[PDB]
Structures are given as structure tokens and as C-alpha cells.
Paper text:
The SARS-CoV-2 spike (S) glycoprotein is exposed at the surface of the virus and mediates entry into host cells. The S glycoprotein is subdivided into two functional subunits, designated S1 and S2, that interact non-covalently after proteolytic cleavage by furin during synthesis. The S1 subunit contains the receptor-binding domain (RBD), which engages the receptor ACE2 (5, 7, 9, 10), and the N-terminal domain (NTD) that recognizes attachment factors. The S2 subunit contains the fusion machinery and undergoes large-scale conformational changes to drive fusion of the virus and host membranes, enabling genome delivery and initiation of infection.
The B.1.617.1 S structure – harboring the HexaPro stabilizing mutations (F817P, A892P, A899P, A942P, K986P, and V987P), a native furin cleavage site, and with an engineered disulfide stapling the RBD in the closed conformation (S383C/D985C) – was determined in complex with S309 (an RBD-targeted neutralizing mAb) and S2L20 (an NTD-targeted non-neutralizing mAb) at 2.4 Å resolution with all three RBDs closed. Local classification and refinements of S309 bound to the B.1.617.1 RBD were used to account for conformational dynamics and improve local resolution of this region to 3.3 Å. S309, the parent mAb of sotrovimab which has received an emergency use authorization from the FDA, is unaffected by antigenic drift observed in variants of concern and interest, including B.1.617.1 and B.1.617.2(+), due to recognition of a conserved RBD epitope, as illustrated here. Our structural data integrated with previous studies emphasize that S309 is a variant-proof neutralizing mAb which is thus far resilient to the emergence of SARS-CoV-2 variants. In both structures, the L452R side chain, which is part of antigenic site Ib, is oriented identically (and modeled in the same rotameric configuration) to what we previously observed in the B.1.427/B.1.429 S structure. The L452R mutation reduces neutralization mediated by some clinical mAbs, such as bamlanivimab (LY-CoV555) and regdanvimab (CT-P59), due to steric alteration of this antigenic site that is incompatible with binding. The B.1.617.1 E484Q RBD mutation is located within the receptor-binding motif, at the boundary between antigenic sites Ia/Ib, and could affect neutralization from mAbs recognizing both subsites. The E484Q mutation is conservative, but could alter electrostatic interactions, as it substitutes the side chain carboxylic group with an amide group through replacement of an oxygen with a nitrogen atom. Residue 484 is involved in the epitopes recognized by bamlanivimab (LY-CoV555) and casirivimab (REGN10933), and both mAbs have dampened binding or neutralization potency against E484Q-harboring mutants likely due to disruption of electrostatic interactions.
Numbering used by the authors:
A (entry chain L): 2 to 105
B (entry chain H): 1 to 129
C (entry chain A): 329 to 528
Write the structure that this text describes.
């Protein structure tokens, strides 16, 4: 299940709402997809698991949902610390990551 | 607090092998599997494989089958990943992460993700001195 | 209490991505571990949590020889059939519990996991059977059921039915028709050394 993400780079000001897309070449179970955040110089951290469930320690401004072949990560407002590269993952078939989206 | 730490950076010749350690604490070691993810400079994340800390069962990404061997020491709660026949394009940071995508005991898929990541071990492969 | 360091794999039983159909329920054996139940009976995520022969708040200091986790998916209205002494299409043809059942039945709503708009027909149950099941008996035969007086010979038709039916699970169904994930923890103590003990 090849995952792709769009846009490659998402240009938004602080305080704006960010929408990050992830698409699958095949249907992905709604419970087998996750989102990660990687800040410059740091290891990735888990933000969302099970498509919509927020991971422990993650701010409530981070949310998401999806089904079928179309999943979305939503950031209700961009904070100074929310400018990072996000990745989508699925483990319905093997385990793969998407290309990654940079928020700038 | 759950913490994962790893070895320092290494420099290897082409054809050589690297064994990257992963020390973990702050949780029941044998309740969670361990995954490894590689990230070459400027690139995205690539899954290498998964190991059960309970029964030793492994699941490797096809690209790394025949090259990567994973082991676990449950007495020192430390994971290891050995990558053989290093190539010049294997230069990357190797991340160790706690796994909750596959059960450690029964091997079935779970609702979760790689919750806790390590610092990342940088491995450079070059013929240069 | 034997010196056991491994913890019981309840997580990977309750947090599994896929559950079995009720006609073909999946049994996982739990042994040689420390069973912490404080994460189950204190969990608000469960809609049903009933125990028979034991109090769930005094289950965290007892030692058992084995614990078996039987997992499957049924619709809301049929959750009441997962109990000792009960009868019905599920109790009689899919999953029967003994009158002296000891253990806990745990269930929760999974409408947002096991349903889709087009209808999730992956889950099935047995509708037709010649006789009732024995306690903890599993029957996954797909042979044609003869309702009438004539032989079917594997062919469907008048008074010849395929024994398994699908659940029409949809996100817009009323609660009684929404999918529930059920895990039954069957406890036993034999004249033997215990292998599953509480956290003490
Ligand atoms: C099935 O998975 C559930 C989700 O697990 C999470 O996601 C997976 C993918 C992994 O990343 C995993 O590591 C994640 O935790 C899992 O739910 C988890 O269950 C544990 C055990 O009960 C919870 O730990 C305790 O939570 C309570 C309640 O926390 C409140 O605040 C959080 C804020 O993050 C909310 O999200 C909660 O809903 C609550 O409102 C804490 O009070 C408690 O702390 C106290 O006890 C500990 C000792 O255990 C002490 O050290 C502390 O000092 C306190 O005295 C724990 O933190 C965990 O929070 C919960 N996850 C989430 C997100 O709530 C579920 O248990 C799994 N099912 C089975 C059978 O395992
Ligand atoms: C306690 O640990 C020892 C090993 O040091 C083991 O031989 C013994 O069987 C354990 N006790 C029980 C009841 O299992």
C-alpha cells in the first residue's frame, strides 16, 4: 500500500489552520494508520494512531480522521513549535511511510 | 518515564557490517516489540524490521531481507540490529523505537504506532580514510 | 506467588486490529505471566463488564492455572446472550457458555472500527444448525443445511440453505445493530501449580 502526501511543502503563517493529506494506493484499515512529527535535529514522535486517536502527551490542537484511501491530519492552529515534517504510516500491509510533508 | 538510548556514530568501509545497540528502560521490556527505522540525509523514513522481545520472532522489510539480523537481550533489556554488506548509500541515521503495531506474544496486528523513539545512531559508509 | 516477571498480554488481546466472526471465535491462551486486572475493571471504555463466580475487585490477588481469552464480534442486542444459562441464535449455534462458567465477559461498542458506509459484511454468524452446541464448542462447517425432507447434495435451493449469514453493519445503524467487540476471559484452577498471578 503505497502512501503519498500532499502538498510537498505547506506554507502557512503562525495562527493559521493546517491541513495535511495522505492518500493510499489501496484501501487502508481505519485502525492501521498513524501520523508522526519530526522536528529539525530530533527523532520523530507519534501524534495520532488508529487514524483518529490522539497519542499520549499530544496537545488537543492536533486531530485527524479518515477512511478508505483518504486520510487527513488537522492542526487547528499553527504554533511556533508546529513547524516540522509530518509523515503518515500504515501497517495494514507490511509497514510503510509516506513521502513526508514539510510545514513552513 | 520511558527512555531509549543508543550507541554513538560509527564509520564503516563498504562491505563491512555495523551492529547498533538500543538500551531501553521505564517499562515492561517483554511486553513491547522493537522496530528499526532508517533515515538517510534529506530523506523520509524507511522501515527496516520488527522483533519480538518475548519470543524472538522477526519481521523484516523485503529490502533488508538477507542483510539485517535483529536480536534481543532480555536480561539487559537491550535490542541490537546488525546490517551486513554495507554500501555507500546506507549512510543514514538508524532509529530504535518501541513498538505497538504488532503483538509481542501472539504476533497479531495492533491499533497503535512506534510510541517511544531513541536518539538515532548515525552510520557513515565510505572508502575514505 | 511464583517469581514471574513477564506480564500478561492483555493489551494485544483488547487492542487487536481484527476480531474473529462469532461463528469462528478465536481463542488465545494466557499463561506464565502476571495478570494486572486494574487496567480492565477500572476502564470506562467498556459498556459491559460482568463477572461470574468472582468479584472483579478481588480478581487482582488470585492465582489461576490458565486464563483463556475468547474474542469475537456480535451485534449489540446479542451481547446479552454471552452469559451462562442463556439461549438464542448466538448462545445455541455460535458460542455457548456453561452453567458453571467462571470468569468475566467484557464488551465494547466498535461502531467506528467495524462498520463502513457501504456495509461491512465481513463478519458472519451461524443461523442454521441441526443441534445446539456444547459449552466452548466451535463449529466452522460451511455445508448446506437441509431444512426439508429431500437431500440438498451441496446445492442451495428450496429448503436448502447456506448456514452462515452476514451482519449488515453500517455506521448509521441503531445501537442494537451496531457491532460490539467481545472478549470472554475464562478462568480455571486445576490441581496444579498456578501460572497466572496478580501483581503482588
Ligand atoms: C489499549 O490501548 C490503550 C491506548 O494506549 C496508548 O496508545 C498505544 C498505541 C500506545 O502508545 C500506549 O503506550 C498508549 O498508552 C491503553 O490505554 C492506556 O492505558 C494505561 C493503563 O491504564 C493508561 O495509563 C494511566 O492512565 C491514567 C489516566 O490518564 C488520564 O489522562 C490521560 C492524558 O494523557 C488521558 O488520555 C486518560 O484518558 C485519562 O484522562 C493515569 O491517571 C495513570 O497515571 C497514574 O498511574 C500510573 C501507574 O500506572 C502512575 O505512574 C501515575 O503517577 C498515576 O498515579 C496512567 O497514566 C494510559 O493513559 C492509557 N492511554 C491513554 C491515551 O489514555 C489501554 O490500556 C490498552 N488496553 C489494554 C487492555 O491494555
Ligand atoms: C523462584 O525462582 C527460582 C529461580 O531463581 C526458580 O527455580 C523457582 O522455581 C521460582 N519459584 C517458583 C514457585 O516458581
Amino acid at each position: 500500500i503505497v502512501l503519498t502526501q500532499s502538498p510537498g511543502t505547506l506554507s502557512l503563517s503562525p495562527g493559521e489552520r493546517a491541513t495535511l493529506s495522505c492518500r493510499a494506493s489501496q484501501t487502508v484499515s481505519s485502525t492501521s494508520l498513524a501520523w508522526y512529527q519530526q522536528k529539525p535535529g530530533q527523532a520523530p514522535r507519534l501524534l495520532i494512531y488508529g487514524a483518529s486517536s490522539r497519542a499520549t502527551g499530544i496537545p488537543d490542537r492536533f486531530s485527524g480522521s479518515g477512511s478508505g484511501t483518504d486520510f487527513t491530519l488537522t492542526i487547528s492552529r499553527l504554533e511556533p513549535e508546529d513547524f516540522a515534517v509530518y509523515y503518515c504510516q500504515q501497517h495494514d500491509t507490511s509497514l510503510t511511510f509516506g513521502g513526508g510533508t514539510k510545514v513552513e | 518515564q520511558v527512555q531509549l538510548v543508543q550507541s554513538g556514530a560509527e564509520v564503516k568501509k563498504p562491505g563491512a557490517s555495523v551492529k547498533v545497540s538500543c538500551k531501553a528502560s521505564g517499562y515492561p521490556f517483554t511486553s513491547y516489540g522493537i522496530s528499526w527505522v532508517r533515515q538517510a540525509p534529506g530523506q523520509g523514513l524507511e522501515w527496516m524490521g520488527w522483533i519480538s522481545t518475548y519470543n524472538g520472532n522477526t519481521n523484516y522489510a523485503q529490502k533488508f531481507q538477507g542483510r539485517v539480523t535483529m536480536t534481543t537481550d532480555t536480561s539487559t533489556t537491550t535490542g541490537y540490529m546488525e546490517l551486513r554488506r554495507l554500501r555507500s548509500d546506507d549512510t543514514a541515521v538508524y532509529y530504535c523505537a518501541r513498538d505497538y503495531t504488532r503483538g509481542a506474544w501472539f504476533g497479531e496486528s495492533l491499533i497503535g504506532g512506534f510510541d517511544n523513539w531513541g536518539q538515532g545512531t548515525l552510520v557513515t559508509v565510505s572508502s575514505a580514510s | 506467588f511464583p517469581n514471574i516477571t513477564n506480564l500478561c498480554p492483555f493489551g494485544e488481546v483488547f487492542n487487536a486490529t481484527r476480531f474473529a466472526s462469532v461463528y469462528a471465535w478465536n481463542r488465545k491462551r494466557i499463561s506464565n505471566c502476571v495478570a494486572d486486572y486494574s487496567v480492565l475493571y477500572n476502564s470506562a471504555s467498556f459498556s459491559t463488564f460482568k463477572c461470574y463466580g468472582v468479584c472483579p475487585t478481588k480478581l487482582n490477588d488470585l492465582c489461576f492455572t490458565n486464563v483463556y481469552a475468547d474474542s469475537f464480534v456480535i451485534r449489540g442486542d446479542e451481547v446479552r446472550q454471552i452469559a451462562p444459562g442463556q439461549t438464542g441464535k448466538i448462545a445455541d449455534y455460535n458460542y455457548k457458555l456453561p452453567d458453571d462458567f467462571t470468569g468475566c465477559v467484557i464488551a465494547w461498542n466498535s461502531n467506528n472500527l467495524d462498520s463502513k458506509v457501504g456495509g461491512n459484511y465481513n463478519y458472519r454468524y451461524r443461523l442454521f444448525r441441526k443441534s445446539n452446541l456444547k459449552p466452548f464448542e466451535r463449529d466452522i462447517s460451511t455445508e448446506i443445511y437441509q431444512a426439508g425432507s429431500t437431500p440438498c447434495n451441496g446445492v442451495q435451493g428450496f429448503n436448502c440453505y447456506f448456514p452462515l449469514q452476514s451482519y449488515g453493519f453500517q455506521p448509521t445503524n441503531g445501537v442494537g445493530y451496531q457491532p460490539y467487540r467481545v472478549v470472554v476471559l475464562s478462568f480455571e484452577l486445576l490441581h496444579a501449580p498456578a501460572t497466572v498471578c496478580g501483581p503482588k
